[PDB]
Amino acid sequence: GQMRLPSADVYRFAEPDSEENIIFEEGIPIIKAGTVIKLIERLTYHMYADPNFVRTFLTTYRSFCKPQELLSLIIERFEIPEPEPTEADRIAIENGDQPLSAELKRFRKEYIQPVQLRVLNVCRHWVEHHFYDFERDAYLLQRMEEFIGTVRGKAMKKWVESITKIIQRKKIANITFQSSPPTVEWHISRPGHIETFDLLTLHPIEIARQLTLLESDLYRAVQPSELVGSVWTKEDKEINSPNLLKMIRHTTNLTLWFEKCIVETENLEERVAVVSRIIEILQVFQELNNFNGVLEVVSAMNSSPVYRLDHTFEQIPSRQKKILEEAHELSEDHYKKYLAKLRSINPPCVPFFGIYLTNILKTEEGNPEVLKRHGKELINFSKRRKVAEITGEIQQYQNQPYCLRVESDIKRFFENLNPMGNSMEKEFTDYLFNKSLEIEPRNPKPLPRFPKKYSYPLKSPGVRPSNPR
Amino acid sequence: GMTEYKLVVVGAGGVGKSALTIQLIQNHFVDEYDPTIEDSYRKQVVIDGETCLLDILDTAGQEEYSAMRDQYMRTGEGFLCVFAINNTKSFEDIHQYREQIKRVKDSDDVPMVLVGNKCDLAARTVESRQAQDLARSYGIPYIETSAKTRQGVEDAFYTLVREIRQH
Amino acid sequence: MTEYKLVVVGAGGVGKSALTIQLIQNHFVDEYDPTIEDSYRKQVVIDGETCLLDILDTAGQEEASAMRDQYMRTGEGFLCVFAINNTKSFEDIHQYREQIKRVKDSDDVPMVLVGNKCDLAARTVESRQAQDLARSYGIPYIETSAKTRQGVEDAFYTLVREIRQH
Ligand SMILES: Nc1nc2c(ncn2[C@@H]2O[C@H](COP(=O)(O)OP(=O)(O)NP(=O)(O)O)[C@@H](O)[C@H]2O)c(=O)[nH]1
Ligand SMILES: C[C@@H](Nc1nc(Nc2ccc(F)c(Cl)c2)nc2ccccc12)C1CC1
Ligand SMILES: [Mg+2]
Ligand code: NA
């Protein structure tokens, strides 16, 4: 027989399942909707563990439950009453004998200990992976420390002492590789001569590598707290989504820098060399699976100032036109080919974040917070699961590091890139378009000639790596 | 076979712009959505008795990727320029969106509609007359929509398709 | 993309979590924080085919020993881990092997025997003894170090190959 449960009058998590409090999707069940009590019961269920559910819940719960209330509810879940002695136990005690306590022992082993351990696993995941709740509410942290630090009894003792230490470490808070990273490559600019660094004087291989390390670090720094609730679109976005915004602003700046390098090169032959070099950088981005970098280049080539430069495009070699066309096609048909390629490559990679943002936003805007059933409002949990499937995909690509060596000077050069200067966006993008009109006027105006601006060789060293002993 | 129209939604973020396409494409009568689903942005419709396929690009949420706007806009034949009727800044942004569309398409006569979107019950700050006057100064239609009742949504998209057909 | 459900089992402290985090993040965890249950995902190309590994990292502490059936039902393949400087953990291997066989009602479950902490000089379980046990199970034996990465990809990706050929 199934174990008997505490009375639902003294322990709220023993109410029977019904369509008035939980709805399952059509081999563990998948929850479509439920009351917060039923969600917490299934989060800490005695029959099975559900690590996906724990991540989904802890990532998304603040849209339906405050952090203080979540802690109260899991403490309530933890405090499970033990059953009274049975008739057989009673008769043994009346004869001065020790009772067998078979039902009590089974209920401890198969209900209390799994539920309590799974509550502690929620606490552990909460502290390790969602610690911002405690950084932003010091009183919440005090309550968690107090709860964990007063759990008695030896069955939980190893995990109680461990979680206490994890909390203390989180309050005051190294990579190994299969191989050595390749040698840093240099072209016209030599090591230490940061004043000469530029698009054509750094080695195109090393430009792509150092931008990939920078863009990988920016990608890896974005936490789910910056995404859930669509907070990067709201008035407090600078407060709630700073790592995401830093990542996007880097991408915008690099795209504008590519555009500025192109249209400020007024001599046609020199501008062809600039565009060819950027396509070579794109080729190395592709080899590195840096899709953010790929699209930084594609966006620049499709911008209004650059796209119209027919005289420049006409002189790009056919093999480079083919590289650029293939990269452009990743974005066509709502990123159909990009999505397939991302799902096929061997990481490390740098995804393009924009698709994730649109899908999180539309998932949150296009599904209701609650479902109404039999006069009750149930939390629409399927909507939160869809959001957490996206944040989980994001996190999966955040794990793998690049086996590339940092060059601190090249890193700083790209960190400090500021193509707009002090200009506002509209003034700057109008400037770029007017430069485009200057260097290749609208027909039927004649094409002017312009003097060279670069005193060094324009020949590319290419993008195949070298290896001395 | 049937004509396909590539439509692009543009406008300020954070003020409910995405509700326009979601409500159109939705199971009109079930309030549910998965945007990751292959062709959650394609819809076959009958407009003035002629069947066509709408392909709608709405990059809502990517507004900070400002250097990608040109690329996204280039894909479109017709544009819905959306502001929120309770956000004057989003209305003041419209002029620059329209100027950017004209530059990207290299035309002074690009099919487009002005859409005023009621995204919540906060007080309206852009009156109908203000937006009608702006649309008339541009020579384009004005449609007002509700982000919650689906009112105006079909009118916004069908009016844009008629602008393309009559270009 | 084929999805594979891997489960890492073995006695407390043998390095199940350190092995998993080394695979996932290329990082060695020095702390000993006993696991209750954790899960990880990894996209990776193995023998030219892209797949998605779901990795369940389980509890070795004896206090959790009554909670194993639920994760054994879901797993497709199992890394059975002991530490080569801990003879009791090696003796515990057969209990995991027999429980997996009972739960899945099968004599033919994909498994790999893993002898971890092979960076440590003071070995107490000889390779020959573990290899004999592996042969009796019909499975490969791979020695690993979560600290240095020795054998780590080999252990996990061999298990993928055995699920694939199952
Ligand atoms: N030298 C060395 N130490 C290791 C290795 N693997 C794990 N350790 C160490 O052994 C300790 C226990 O590791 P851990 O991964 O937590 O083991 P576990 O099997 O997951 N323990 P549990 O079953 O309680 O979750 C840690 O201090 C860890 O750094 C290894 O390959 N070499
Ligand atoms: C593959 C590329 N296709 C095209 N690009 C450009 N122009 C352009 C591109 C790159 C440049 F470096 C410069 Cl200078 C100009 N014009 C086109 C005109 C008609 C048809 C296709 C075009 C797209 C990724 C941009
Ligand atoms: Mg562990
Ligand atoms: Na306003």
Side-chain angles (χ1 to χ4, degrees):
Chain A
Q2 287 199 295
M3 290 174 294
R4 296 181 173 172
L5 301 170
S7 147
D9 284 313
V10 302
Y11 186 70
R12 291 199 285 166
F13 303 94
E15 183 79 13
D17 287 350
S18 83
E19 286 237 329
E20 295 187 352
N21 59 41
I22 188 167
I23 297 174
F24 296 101
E25 301 281 2
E26 315 295 321
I28 70 174
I30 304 165
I31 296 171
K32 176 172 183 178
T35 65
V36 69
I37 292 303
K38 279 291 167 183
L39 294 179
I40 286 178
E41 179 183 354
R42 289 282 172 162
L43 183 68
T44 54
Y45 203 58
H46 82 276
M47 291 297 290
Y48 53 75
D50 198 353
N52 295 340
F53 187 43
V54 175
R55 181 187 59 81
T56 291
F57 187 101
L58 287 175
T59 297
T60 63
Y61 78 89
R62 301 156 196 83
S63 54
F64 59 82
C65 181
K66 289 179 174 161
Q68 291 278 346
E69 177 62 12
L70 175 58
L71 181 56
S72 298
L73 288 165
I74 67 180
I75 293 170
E76 189 186 348
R77 178 70 163 138
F78 190 88
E79 292 173 350
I80 304 161
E82 291 188 341
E84 294 297 318
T86 62
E87 186 78 356
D89 301 339
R90 172 191 182 87
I91 288 166
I93 292 159
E94 289 168 359
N95 286 291
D97 297 324
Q98 223 63 36
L100 294 181
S101 299
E103 298 82 357
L104 170 64
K105 290 171 177 176
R106 177 188 182 196
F107 186 77
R108 287 173 175 161
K109 177 177 185 178
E110 293 178 15
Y111 193 93
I112 297 177
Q113 284 171 22
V115 173
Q116 290 191 331
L117 240 224
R118 288 176 179 141
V119 165
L120 295 182
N121 201 24
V122 172
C123 292
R124 184 187 196 262
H125 278 78
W126 195 353
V127 166
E128 285 193 338
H129 303 304
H130 313 268
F131 195 69
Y132 74 99
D133 289 332
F134 306 101
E135 298 172 328
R136 301 176 189 180
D137 187 344
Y139 174 59
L140 183 75
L141 177 57
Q142 298 180 348
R143 288 185 65 209
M144 173 68 78
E145 290 162 330
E146 298 294 305
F147 165 61
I148 297 290
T150 57
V151 167
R152 317 295 178 195
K154 58 187 173 205
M156 299 303 105
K157 175 181 171 190
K158 291 175 182 169
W159 292 282
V160 162
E161 294 175 356
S162 176
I163 292 166
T164 294
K165 286 184 289 193
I166 291 167
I167 286 169
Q168 298 299 315
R169 297 201 313 255
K170 271 300 233 219
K171 282 163 83 182
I172 62 188
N174 175 236
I175 301 298
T176 142
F177 281 112
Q178 296 284 143
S179 8
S180 263
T183 300
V184 169
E185 306 236 351
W186 296 96
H187 176 47
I188 294 159
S189 294
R190 301 316 298 185
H193 290 250
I194 70 181
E195 64 284 350
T196 66
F197 286 10
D198 208 343
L199 174 67
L200 297 173
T201 54
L202 290 168
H203 200 294
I205 298 179
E206 205 57 48
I207 290 170
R209 288 170 174 173
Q210 294 305 314
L211 281 170
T212 294
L213 283 167
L214 210 49
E215 290 168 17
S216 180
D217 281 352
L218 291 167
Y219 175 75
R220 287 162 60 99
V222 183
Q223 301 302 305
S225 65
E226 315 183 40
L227 308 176
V228 299
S230 303
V231 292
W232 78 95
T233 71
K234 301 193 173 308
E235 290 214 311
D236 284 346
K237 60 188 174 196
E238 304 287 346
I239 296 168
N240 291 311
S241 303
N243 295 304
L244 178 78
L245 292 174
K246 287 176 179 181
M247 180 278 298
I248 301 175
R249 287 161 185 165
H250 166 93
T251 291
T252 302
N253 270 337
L254 256 301
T255 298
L256 295 175
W257 182 67
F258 286 140
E259 296 178 28
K260 184 184 176 185
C261 290
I262 292 165
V263 303
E264 292 191 337
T265 303
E266 301 170 20
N267 178 268
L268 174 57
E269 177 186 355
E270 293 188 323
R271 185 166 63 256
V272 170
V274 165
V275 165
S276 288
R277 199 70 62 89
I278 294 163
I279 295 169
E280 289 187 313
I281 290 159
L282 160 64
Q283 180 174 355
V284 182
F285 280 156
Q286 285 270 49
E287 293 171 3
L288 292 171
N289 301 318
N290 177 2
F291 301 108
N292 179 77
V294 170
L295 296 179
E296 288 174 340
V297 173
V298 174
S299 298
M301 301 300 184
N302 286 292
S303 67
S304 287
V306 176
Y307 185 85
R308 58 174 304 279
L309 300 175
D310 292 346
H311 295 278
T312 307
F313 187 67
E314 167 155 33
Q315 298 197 21
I316 296 304
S318 174
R319 70 162 76 75
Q320 290 198 304
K321 285 188 170 119
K322 191 184 163 195
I323 290 167
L324 179 58
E325 174 60 22
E326 178 187 312
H328 179 67
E329 294 188 7
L330 293 178
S331 71
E332 293 175 355
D333 301 308
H334 302 256
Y335 286 103
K336 182 180 183 63
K337 282 173 175 176
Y338 163 74
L339 293 167
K341 189 177 191 188
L342 176 64
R343 286 156 178 75
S344 71
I345 51 77
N346 194 34
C349 66
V350 188
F352 171 59
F353 226 108
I355 298 165
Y356 293 138
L357 300 179
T358 293
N359 286 342
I360 289 171
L361 176 67
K362 290 177 178 176
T363 298
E364 287 193 344
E365 173 71 28
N367 295 280
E369 295 284 82
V370 302
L371 301 179
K372 290 162 168 175
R373 300 286 187 275
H374 314 290
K376 313 290 174 177
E377 298 195 353
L378 304 184
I379 297 162
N380 181 8
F381 196 73
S382 72
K383 164 185 193 179
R384 279 72 174 195
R385 178 168 48 255
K386 287 176 170 57
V387 171
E389 277 168 10
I390 302 167
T391 63
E393 174 174 341
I394 291 166
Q395 296 185 275
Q396 188 277 130
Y397 295 117
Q398 292 178 319
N399 287 317
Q400 306 95 337
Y402 275 92
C403 183
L404 297 168
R405 185 179 283 97
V406 169
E407 214 293 332
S408 291
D409 285 332
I410 303 178
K411 170 185 185 61
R412 196 145 35 239
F413 174 81
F414 286 108
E415 284 183 328
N416 294 344
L417 224 48
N418 188 23
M420 304 201 338
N422 304 305
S423 301
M424 303 296 101
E425 183 198 337
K426 174 185 163 55
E427 166 192 3
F428 181 69
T429 51
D430 286 345
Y431 162 76
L432 293 182
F433 191 75
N434 287 323
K435 285 301 296 180
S436 179
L437 293 179
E438 174 184 7
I439 65 187
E440 296 191 20
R442 277 187 194 97
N443 291 330
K445 292 183 162 137
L447 179 63
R449 301 176 170 100
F450 300 85
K452 291 182 38 71
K453 73 188 290 184
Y454 303 119
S455 51
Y456 46 76
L458 307 175
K459 185 170 181 64
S460 171
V463 289
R464 300 262 46 84
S466 296
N467 204 14
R469 88 182 171 184
Chain B
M2 65 173 71
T3 304
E4 176 170 340
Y5 298 107
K6 293 191 134 45
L7 314 179
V8 176
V9 177
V10 308
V15 289
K17 166 178 62 169
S18 64
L20 176 65
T21 303
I22 288 172
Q23 287 182 108
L24 175 82
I25 299 273
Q26 226 159 13
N27 188 332
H28 168 2
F29 302 111
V30 176
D31 290 358
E32 224 263 38
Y33 201 62
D34 186 1
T36 68
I37 278 325
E38 276 273 357
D39 322 354
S40 64
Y41 44 79
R42 293 168 81 77
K43 189 186 185 76
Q44 184 176 298
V45 301
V46 180
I47 302 172
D48 301 330
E50 180 176 355
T51 306
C52 62
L53 184 61
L54 307 184
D55 179 292
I56 303 151
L57 180 67
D58 180 4
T59 57
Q62 298 180 55
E63 289 79 17
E64 185 70 32
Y65 288 96
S66 60
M68 300 188 67
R69 262 192 241 122
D70 283 355
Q71 163 155 261
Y72 284 139
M73 285 170 173
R74 182 178 305 297
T75 74
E77 321 165 49
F79 300 82
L80 300 93
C81 299
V82 185
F83 67 95
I85 59 166
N86 61 358
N87 190 279
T88 302
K89 181 57 160 52
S90 70
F91 179 66
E92 292 164 351
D93 291 340
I94 290 292
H95 176 66
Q96 189 48 45
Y97 284 117
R98 171 171 166 87
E99 289 301 304
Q100 184 168 14
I101 291 167
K102 283 159 59 182
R103 173 176 293 176
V104 167
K105 302 300 294 186
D106 188 30
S107 169
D108 284 326
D109 185 25
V110 180
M112 72 177 69
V113 293
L114 181 64
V115 178
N117 185 30
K118 174 183 182 58
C119 52
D120 51 48
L121 274 300
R124 165 190 294 258
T125 58
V126 182
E127 303 300 314
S128 143
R129 181 57 175 253
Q130 296 174 254
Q132 291 280 5
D133 288 354
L134 182 68
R136 174 162 295 279
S137 78
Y138 295 155
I140 66 177
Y142 177 56
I143 307 96
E144 283 202 357
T145 62
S146 170
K148 295 168 195 177
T149 67
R150 207 171 175 270
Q151 291 166 276
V153 170
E154 291 183 354
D155 194 18
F157 286 97
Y158 290 14
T159 294
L160 177 57
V161 168
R162 298 178 178 113
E163 289 294 296
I164 295 163
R165 285 176 176 170
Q166 296 172 25
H167 176 263
Chain C
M1 226 182 336
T2 316
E3 193 167 343
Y4 297 97
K5 296 167 208 299
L6 318 190
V7 183
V8 182
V9 303
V14 301
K16 300 180 298 296
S17 296
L19 278 167
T20 300
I21 292 168
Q22 183 60 254
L23 186 79
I24 297 294
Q25 300 172 7
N26 285 61
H27 165 67
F28 175 60
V29 170
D30 269 285
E31 291 81 8
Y32 181 177
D33 300 329
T35 308
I36 293 166
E37 194 170 307
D38 293 342
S39 74
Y40 301 85
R41 302 193 113 187
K42 180 176 185 67
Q43 176 178 320
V44 53
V45 178
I46 300 173
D47 301 331
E49 286 182 62
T50 316
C51 52
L52 186 57
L53 311 185
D54 310 315
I55 302 176
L56 201 60
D57 180 27
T58 70
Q61 303 306 315
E62 284 310 310
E63 288 78 359
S65 66
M67 300 164 57
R68 298 181 187 152
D69 285 22
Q70 51 96 24
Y71 69 66
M72 290 176 179
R73 280 190 284 268
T74 67
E76 287 175 282
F78 298 79
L79 289 192
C80 298
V81 185
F82 68 98
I84 68 161
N85 68 336
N86 183 345
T87 55
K88 183 170 160 44
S89 74
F90 178 70
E91 297 164 359
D92 292 341
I93 284 290
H94 78 92
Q95 305 166 12
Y96 276 100
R97 160 87 175 183
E98 295 307 324
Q99 190 171 358
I100 292 162
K101 285 172 52 184
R102 170 184 62 76
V103 167
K104 307 195 73 69
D105 192 28
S106 171
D107 194 18
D108 186 47
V109 181
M111 298 185 194
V112 174
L113 183 64
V114 174
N116 192 41
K117 309 201 186 181
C118 74
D119 56 281
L120 298 177
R123 163 195 300 270
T124 63
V125 180
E126 297 308 320
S127 294
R128 170 65 186 278
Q129 180 178 22
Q131 190 69 240
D132 287 348
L133 184 65
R135 287 192 298 106
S136 84
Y137 295 165
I139 67 179
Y141 171 54
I142 296 174
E143 287 186 352
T144 59
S145 170
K147 183 176 178 178
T148 70
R149 280 183 79 76
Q150 182 174 4
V152 171
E153 285 181 359
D154 194 17
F156 280 94
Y157 300 168
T158 294
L159 181 58
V160 174
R161 292 182 186 104
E162 305 184 343
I163 299 168
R164 190 190 64 210
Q165 82 193 13
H166 185 250

